[PDB]
């Protein structure tokens with residue numbers, strides 16, 4: 407998160423860290439046994455870390471749980487990044503509660519809606535600086551047209567842009583899979599962008615409201 | 629020669645550690661890969677990297 411602020415210990419209880427010997431992606435707890443993240447974050451041997459603030463020191467509020475299953479959307483396209491969504495089943499259920507799940511949306515959010523984006527990703531746009539604690543960012547959802555003008559022929563109906571055209575505030579490497587929460591509902595998943603916090607290049611996110619049926623049914627038959 | 633190309637992080641936001649052959653140093657080094665659109669000078673281990681690009 408570039409241009410954000412320290413969230414505060416366990417103030418984003420649905421935020422999880424995907425660990426493979428080190429933090430590599432974020433994700434959201436939507437059920438005591440399920441986590442939603444990005445399809446490009448798919449990896450073998452994923453350990454999910456819940457109740458985290460400082461990802462480098464054990465503060466006692468954590469729960470480390472291995473993933474038993476990792477389901478990448480059947481239509482995920484690694485070239486176009488369309489359908490960049492994945493569900494991770496926890497090997498055992500988490501104890502909810504510093505750890506809590508986030509609700510799925512009843513409907514899509516409109517341009518202008520202010521959302522909270524969080525993660526342990528890079529905090530520098532022209533550099534490298536990874537935080538110990540969780541960073542937060544309030545950014546508004548942008549219109550489909552501006553999103554499409556920022557990335558010509560790259561935006562699908564399953565993606566939405568959020569952020570600031572001026573730049574300086576954005577998600578970055580290490581934030582992928584993390585939540586974009588608006589009005590207490592999970593509306594997006596950190597996905598891709600051109601560089602980080604660049605002007606006229608806002609971050610692109612997976613439009614969660616388009617997958618609610620798939621999510622509910624997939625969780626239920628696995 | 630893809631072994632001579634600089635490492636490519638790509639547009640995705642993940643922070644995945646990969647290896648690339650650094651021809652100037654004559655060895656495989658680590659770099660942060662974003663998770664999508666990898667180029668060929670991107671390996672999962674130093675052994676794979678040395679096997680494919682070593683001495684290029």
Ligand SMILES: [Ca+2]
Nearest residue numbers: 460463464465
């Ligand atoms: Ca910790």
